[PDB]
Design a binder for these strands. Structure first.
Ligand SMILES: [Mg+2]
Ligand SMILES: [Mg+2]
Ligand SMILES: [Zn+2]
Lengths: 141, 66, 148, 176, 94, 38
RNA sequence: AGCCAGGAUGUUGGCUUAGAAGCAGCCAUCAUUUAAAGAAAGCGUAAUAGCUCACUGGUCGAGUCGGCCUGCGCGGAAGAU
């Protein structure tokens, strides 16, 4: 990327990208090919896993068709189906409700290795600290 | 919509326009069409039907006096 | 900023790189974006990690405050904006190479590459390097000489 | 201070001609011109002019500072000459130049016809552009202003005589 | 560390005291020990700056009256009713 | 322009000037902040 | 002080909202990558986008920032033959 022009990003779902009220039409509208979001999308989607959030960019100008750019998963959401609670609080942050794992955060953050700056790959865990102190949740470290 | 004492509840993003969803009191939507037109250069449908009865703000209530 | 003490550190840490180093190269980052640094750190990354630097300092007042030590070829390098790159382990390596190739991808100027020390002098891209361990380019020299 | 204290280069092509309080400056263009100073004291010699306070003036320095600054710009004028540039925006906003008078059409029920002064000349790259070079800095300023005045840029569609190095804020139309 | 130069007061009384304060000085007194109390006149701004540091009140401090070095601890301070100024200081003799 | 007895700065872009005897406030961002009679 | 550059990655922090993505609100404010870059001081967006500041590297080349005690002044200040 040496010339940004259009990078709309509103996370989607792997098993079936083909919505309508949330995104649907407007997820590829202004010179974009709506059809291609099942031919090219799922060409790197099911490569991994199906069901959960997936941010994304495309590279279409006014060139009709296009190639679909894969992306990372968010690093704080990996504190739900790979951790515990799925909301975030319930009880106002006057009291620190949640609860965290020290084992996890390493390899399960490591999953996001190719989207981070920390040279040391254990540093990258140190980043998931506050990101997973999302409520003030401390780890039985 | 907000100015009309109105409550919002969604935005979809319908293709080319943007469906905007709101619950707003009847006694406030009168002559809506005319200003909606002014705000949107004349391109903006809208539609309404009855939904519910909610508390009228005090100033409203005490005014509504027969 | 910080007071004296912290400049000294900016020196002693920097000048024990030179005192225990390998290769040296330049660059003027007028336009040096952050995608810029990000990348060359993955390059310091392949080129170990944090074995390398680029501590922008070209205040003569700083990264010349390590020069009348070694590499007084840099009283001349230290004017205007400059990004001094030190090598610790590694061959007198590639560091050199992608500096030209990088800045040869627009990636801002390279000070025309005012160049650096291994010998004691100036400019010119050399891949006289990471061939290094191309003692295989002295292994193909055994049987080919032995046969032919 | 600073501006006063700093000196000023006189690049080959300038004559320069101080007499009492009356500097003068010709060049490749450069309609000469001669200003006056006061509580300031100028000094010739050198390839430079140097300005400083004159004894017994609380205004000195503060005054000396402007003196330098003015002189400086004269030379600059007499060298490269000064720029300008205003562009018209809005339907039917033409501009002409009929010699040393600029013919503008700015949505009025009459013609404007603005007559340029002395040391300024102007030309029209487009019907929708004007440029005037000249010696005296302060004057091209003046002219640029008055020319802008016939229709200062309005904030709803930015219509009118702009500056180019402008900003023209502009703002969204009321909710009717 | 605080060294407080000082001069013996030639005049006592509200009249003198008032005149003092106008000329950026101010009266003080040293007492304690077995030897008599001394009427002092210190410079306001010097001491005014000093008393800003909390040590002034805790550390032991030394006063130089006609070059004698009396060395005392601050017993009490009279501050102005509403200005950032000093009126009077009591010094107890260690 | 507001003509208040107190003038003061309102934005970090508002500058305060003294032309003639008058104390003014100039704001490069917001025309609503122009002021006289300070 | 000007002027040249950067002003970043986890990431839209969590909660809360129709929407709160540095920036309406509640709570916390860490970790990185570094020359330096706030879970952001302001402008801006329906929310994003976008423009700055803080901070840092460059240029410049000798002073410079704001409080304290004070003297004299400026505005605030419109009337009837
Ligand atoms: Mg009396
Ligand atoms: Mg009067
Ligand atoms: Zn303002």
């Amino acid at each position: 990327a040496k010339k940004v022009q259009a990078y709309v990003k509103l996370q989607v779902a792997a098993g079936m990208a083909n919505p309508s009220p949330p995104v649907g039409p407007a997820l590829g509208q202004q010179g974009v090919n709506i059809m291609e979001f099942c031919k090219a999308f799922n060409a790197k989607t099911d490569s991994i896993e199906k069901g959960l959030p997936i941010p994304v960019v495309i590279t279409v100008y006014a060139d009709r068709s296009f190639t679909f750019v894969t992306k990372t998963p968010p690093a704080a959401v990996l504190l739900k189906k790979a951790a515990g609670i799925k909301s975030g609080s319930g009880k106002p942050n006057k009291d620190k409700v949640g609860k965290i794992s020290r084992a996890q955060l390493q390899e399960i953050a490591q999953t996001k290795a190719a989207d981070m700056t920390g040279a040391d790959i254990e540093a990258m865990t140190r980043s998931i600290e506050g990101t997973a102190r999302s409520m003030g949740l401390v780890v039985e470290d | 919509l907000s100015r009309r004492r109105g409550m919002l509840k969604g935005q979809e993003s319908e293709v080319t326009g943007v469906k905007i969803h709101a619950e707003v009191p009847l006694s406030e939507m009168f002559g809506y069409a005319t200003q909606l037109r002014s705000l949107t250069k004349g391109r903006a449908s809208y539609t309404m039907e009855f939904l519910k009865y909610d508390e009228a703000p005090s100033n409203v209530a005490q005014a509504v006096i027969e | 900023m910080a007071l004296n003490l912290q400049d000294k550190q900016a020196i002693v840490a920097e000048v024990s790189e030179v005192a225990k180093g390998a290769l040296s190269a330049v660059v003027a980052d007028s336009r040096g974006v952050t995608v810029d640094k990000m990348t060359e750190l993955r390059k310091a990354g392949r080129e170990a990690g944090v074995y390398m630097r680029v501590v922008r300092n070209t205040l003569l007042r700083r990264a010349v405050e390590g020069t009348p030590f070694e590499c007084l070829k840099d009283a001349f390098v230290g004017p205007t904006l400059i990004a001094y790159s030190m090598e610790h382990p590694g061959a007198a390596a590639r560091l050199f190479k992608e500096f030209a190739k990088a800045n040869a991808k627009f990636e801002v100027k390279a000070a025309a590459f005012e160049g650096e020390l291994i010998p004691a002098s100036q400019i010119d891209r050399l891949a006289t390097l990471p061939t290094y361990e191309e003692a295989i380019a002295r292994l193909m020299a055994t049987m080919k000489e032995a046969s032919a | 201070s600073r501006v006063a204290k700093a000196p000023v280069v006189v690049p080959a092509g300038v004559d320069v001609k101080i007499n009492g309080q009356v500097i003068t400056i010709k060049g490749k263009n450069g309609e000469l011109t001669r200003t006056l100073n006061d509580a300031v004291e100028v000094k010739h010699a050198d390839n430079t002019l140097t300005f400083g306070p004159r004894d017994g003036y609380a205004d000195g320095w503060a005054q000396a500072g402007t003196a330098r600054a003015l002189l400086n710009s004269m030379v600059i004028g007499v060298t490269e000459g000064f720029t300008k540039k205003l562009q018209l925006v809005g339907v039917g906003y033409r501009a002409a130049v009929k010699g040393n008078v600029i013919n503008l059409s700015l949505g009025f029920s009459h013609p404007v016809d603005h007559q340029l002064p002395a040391g300024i000349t102007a030309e029209c790259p487009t019907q929708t552009e004007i440029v005037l070079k000249g010696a005296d800095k302060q004057v091209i300023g003046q002219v640029a202003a008055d020319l802008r005045a016939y229709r200062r840029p309005e904030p709803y569609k930015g219509k009118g005589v702009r500056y180019a190095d402008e900003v023209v804020r502009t703002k969204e139309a009321k909710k009717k | 560390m605080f060294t407080i130069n000082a001069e013996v007061r030639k005049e006592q009384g509200k009249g003198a005291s008032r005149r003092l304060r106008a000329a950026n000085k101010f009266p003080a007194i040293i007492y304690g020990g077995k030897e008599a109390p001394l009427a002092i006149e210190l410079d306001h701004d010097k001491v005014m700056n000093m008393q800003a540091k909390a040590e002034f009140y805790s550390e032991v401090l030394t006063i130089v009256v006609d070059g004698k070095e009396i060395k005392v601890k601050a017993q009490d301070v009279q501050r102005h009713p509403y200005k950032p100024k000093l009126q009077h200081i009591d010094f107890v003799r260690a | 322009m507001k003509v208040r007895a107190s003038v003061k700065k309102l934005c970090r872009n508002c500058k305060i000037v003294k032309r003639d005897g008058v104390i003014r406030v100039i704001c490069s961002a917001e025309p609503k902040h122009k002021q006289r009679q300070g």
